[model samples]
Target chain A: HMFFKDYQKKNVMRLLQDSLEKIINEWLKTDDESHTKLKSLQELSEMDINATSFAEHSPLPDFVTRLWLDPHKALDAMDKNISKNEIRKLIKETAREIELVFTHQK
Target chain B: LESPGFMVHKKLKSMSQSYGVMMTGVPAEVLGQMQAERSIPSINKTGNLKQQIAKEVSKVCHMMTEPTQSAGQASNDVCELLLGKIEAEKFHFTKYEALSADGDNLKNVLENTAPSSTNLLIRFEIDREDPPIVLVKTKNENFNPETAVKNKIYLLENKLYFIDKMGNLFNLGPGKKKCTQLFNAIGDSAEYSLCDPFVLEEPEKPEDFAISEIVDIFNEQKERFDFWIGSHSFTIYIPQTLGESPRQFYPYQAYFGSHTLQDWFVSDKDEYLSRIGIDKYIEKLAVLGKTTNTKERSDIYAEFFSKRGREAFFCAHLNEKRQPLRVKFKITEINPELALKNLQETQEFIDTHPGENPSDKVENYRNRAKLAMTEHLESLLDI
Candidate 1:
């Protein structure tokens, strides 16, 4: 009921989405390494730096967890208006690892 | 647990008898083997009933799964387990239901649910828009303003700048956070989060809702998250990620398209009224139809009111000056002695407030500060 007209929640979402895509794609390009660097990105989102405080509050852990569980699910859930192709692919890669080693399949 | 001795004990005792029935179905040899191999204890018919029932459950579970070798013979042990799990779950739930039925509502149940008073945290915010001071109205006392001056709080670019442990600044506002990292967001807030969810039960659906629809078409077909914990398959809704069914309002899904954060409704504001207005309340707080007893139910002034929660309190307070101040960070921590050297200010502000309204005094200060800031801003512009 209080006004947040001055507070741009959508703009904040874009910056966060862009920052995450950057981290995921960056992790992919590294050709080497915690997934640790990717974790740090998650921390940044969680830490509430910059505009991240505006839109999303506590979904980063659940978001990253579910992204690997289902890419379409995570993106659509965050109301992702921006392009999600790159993040979606990275998540697809993660899901394979879960199925390969973490799954119940024989 | 409230009336466990007579009420739920009888209830649990009945279910335990059912457990006894289920065990009869298992082969006697299988039960005999499980008892020895697993070394499971016999149900103590005379002890803490729940623990006894748990022992019975483990007995079934042991026979349901363990491998061979009960001293010269094979001790054997899903459906049985699932059924046992469901029943075991029912027993525990029934015990908890006794908590609500006996205690009456959630406020009493949850308060007792915690370990103690420490779990109920309290914080403060320097009000924004007016004097940029936190107004703490204590027992038999008035609101103190001047006694409060903050160290890490700063005013810059009209945004509330919070100085962290490392001395870096975070502009805490809507989407403008670096401060959410400062507090343990979920667990701390979860203590107060149990409320009638402000959002629709199903954000996208066309059919069901909050109120009764008599005429069908003319009825307001809206829905809200159920207040009573007994609504769905489960009493507690463990926040699910996007993958689960609308099953209920998902915190992550709240940000989705067409659903602004506004659509993501959760309120602790009403809790404030329930506490401070206790002056008008005669009955024990527990007797009221269970609502979030707001603050610790002991301290009405502990309510967080910047932009709704502790997160936004700093936020709304940051906008207070809307111009310039030395430091714009004040969710009170509200303890003035963060460093010391301010004993005089605290007493002075508290004592000088022999004024009036005791409560409305904050509005008066804010009204004055608002005028002062306007003139200051005008003067700065002229400069």
Candidate 2:
């Protein structure tokens, strides 16, 4: 239930950053309620930082994101005939694409 | 166990929480597109489509440096992402919340995920932008003679080794003899003589397989965790630069670094070898053998033997401290072209960015990028 209702990974990292950028830029131009949201968005991003790690640093994903876009392709990946290595190849391709699109300005 | 002083930041925890909220039930198109294939296609690739497009954008922070420079002066977006936000988050994730969580769950989690001795251990790790990964480490524990007989997963000679415990004992497997030979070749680096880790489903998560099926595979494995994790050993030997003697030697079990050979004859193995048989190749080496003595052979080999050399660079990883970590490798196709590229590129990178010490070496940089890239691949698809 936590994953089903509480999380969406498809575009969260990019989207939150996108929203913050958009609102901040818009506020610079219009200075309205929409712009005010930028402050909270920036705060939201900062507030979500994980500070409890005792080490000077830690490395882990903030949360897990499930990709539901291509169930058929996902299922194709599940084929017994397909080598797991091929599946990894498929994922690599996907990750590169997502990284490209997300990091680039819309 | 959680290391000293490690604590998860509440801000990171909440960021994860909010990010989680924003990524549920994505449209099918978005998800499906994530499954399609994309790669450098060739080793000569200087930049991928992602970085190419980013070139047009105005330069901002360059996380590669202290002041955060732009892409043009440094590596591409991938470098910044890996060195900056991605690296930072990784630190926050593992060192903080994951290890320092309440009641010291880090040790519990790691042990539960990868126990010291078990017939079969399966664990899952889910992360943002990627499908959950299910890792299975089959152990030789719980080897009772009775239950293994009932399950019957392994084939003994001709008949099946049932799931009963007794059946598990009989199937300790015939490869043990061969394992000993291979283990000795590696200088008894590991106590257990066994096969290296071979992916049951390649890049796919083990969770995709039904629990019953996983159980069957484990039951069939004949309590061979050592055999399972030791299917192959990869060693990387780094020679001492100043000393007259050889360098420190290190070896690791190559698990997911198969792609290192993607462009090599090794991946194509038999096809290429049959064209030029091993006997002929050894004969060629014989000629070179006369010209080079043991030390000479080592120096010539060093041209391609550098740690994390081109092909070996594919297996890179970052340690707990965020410094680039490398594994010693012994088995890999010694392709001259690959050797040249890795040597030159690594030397150049080290020379240019002397400050990136933790991962500044050719082997360190490429390996970190490769491993991170591999992990990135995991995050995008259900592999």
Candidate 3:
């Protein structure tokens, strides 16, 4: 049971990483042109590179730091196991945090 | 949905999320029916296409921004705002991690591991000089909701307490009045901190009962006020600039903890107006008109200050028995002295912070602030 749990955790971690890349790509091709022009928006590249190792250490950006561990936390902190849908939602919400922070922050 | 009007509604809804606007008045059922019909006759009733769209868009925007009165309703709104859904029943308690003295690691944890939608149950063990916080997060499975306190912590007479999901307020252990000092410390700290975030969750509609009613309930038992005052502390709005055109008040600078009469009167203004019932106030004052421009809003404020202005201050000092206390002033008396003091302080502020004003016309902001402060004073004055 313990091995299976660890295996499932690894599987979820893999899915989270893949989703992170996919979502960042979508964000880069954002509909809002104004988002592309921000100096903070340029920080997205650094974040993407860091996203690979973000699990090991904290992301440099405050917004990303606030959000990076969301998907894992949802899975790890659960009493039972997290659903694929819930994980997907958590990842999507994490991605949404980028746009929200960029758009709303002064 | 093909109709430009329905399309405008959709655009406004998208904008609301970005602009922090809340849509009200137009029921979801009615909106969907209109979308089904692909028509917005009323939207296109009077103005040019662009203007018409902008009008409907603004209405939805205004609706979204209105505050609610019920704590439960407010929590629901905030949960929806932060997370996709409430998921109250589905969530399970996983663990509670206590932060160290320096709390730097905990800060990192907050920025890194905190979930977006999950309610953080923070227990401040503040008996010691260096207080630590216990951060609890629930998991995706089930738990005992009855035993599980969703999101309230309390301090009473140097003891710590919390209200469970079942809504009972009692001391847990090793804390009571210690909680009060800790809450005060948090309240006094900078905005956007851990303590202030939950306080920002305002309700959607006017509460069925007003602030006065809530205060009355608090007076019923001294213990109630001990727990309640800490949680109900609110941010106060002061004008950002002197004569700003819209006469706006920003909530960033000061907070009202309602520890005393004056604080209660000033801090409770927004909640009192909303919870007393927005519609009742709207009809009574004849505000929230078809066209919600700056001038109309200004008039509404003018009238509101004129009528309920002095009365609120008097009402704040009433004893638990609802009798007027002979502390200093008469029941009907308005204090011009306090008003003058406020005005002078405001003028000094205007003089000191000339460059801090956000408006293009600095004089306009100053003048507006002056007028607003004066009006606030007048409301408190007998004359």
| Clash count of each predicted structure | 25, 88, 31
List, residue by residue over B1-383, the lDDT tens digit for candidate 2: 32110111121122212221111222222222221212211112343544432321111111111121111111111111112333323422432121121223323433342112211111111111111122122223533435332222332222222333223333333354433332232322222211212323332333223222333454455334321111121221111122232212211111222212112212332133324432332233332233324344333222222223333232223211111111111111122232233233323323442335433332343333344334334444333
lDDT of 1 at A65: 41
- The per-prediction CA RMSD against the true structure, in angstroms, equals 32.1, 26.1, 26.2
Model 2 lDDT tens row, A7-100? 1231322322332233233333433555443333333333322322211221111110111223234333222333434333333343333333
Candidate 3 chain B, which ten residues in sequence have the lowest lDDT sum? B324-333
Quote model 1's TM-score for chain B. Answer: 0.16
Ranking by lDDT: 3, 2, 1
Worst 10 residues of 3 chain A by lDDT: A1-10
DockQ of model 1, rounded to 2 decimals: 0.02
Using Cα atoms, each model's DockQ against the true complex is: 0.02, 0.06, 0.02
Candidate 1 lDDT over B288-335, as tens digits, reads: 223334323213212221223443233233323122111111010111
lDDT, each prediction = 0.26, 0.26, 0.30
- Candidate 1 vs. truth: CA RMSD? 32.1
Give per-residue lDDT, candidate 1, residue B210.
12
- The whole-model C-alpha lDDT of candidate 1 against the native structure comes to 0.26
Candidate 3 lDDT tens digits, B1-383: 13222232223223223222111111222222222112132343334554444344334322223331222222222222222221311211212233333343333543443122212212211111111122122221422335543333333334344443235554444443444444343322222221222232442322212212222332344333222111211121211122322222111111112122222233444335545442244243332222245445334433333223444342232311121111100001112233233223323433443444323223343343333323322222221
Residue B126 accuracy (lDDT) in model 2:
11
The candidate that wins on DockQ is 2
